[PDB]
Structures are given as C-alpha cells and as structure tokens.
Amino acid sequence: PRXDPRXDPRXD
Numbered sequence: 001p002r003x004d005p006r007x008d009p010r011x012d
Ligand code: NA
Pocket: 001, 005, 006, 007, 008, 009, 010
C-alpha cells in the first residue's frame, strides 16, 4: 500500500 493507502490497502 505504499503511496496513498486510501481504499483497500491490501498488497503493497
Ligand atoms: Na490499495
């Protein structure tokens, strides 16, 4: 989720 983690931060 690096960067903007809004929404669904699953994964990176
Ligand atoms: Na995401």
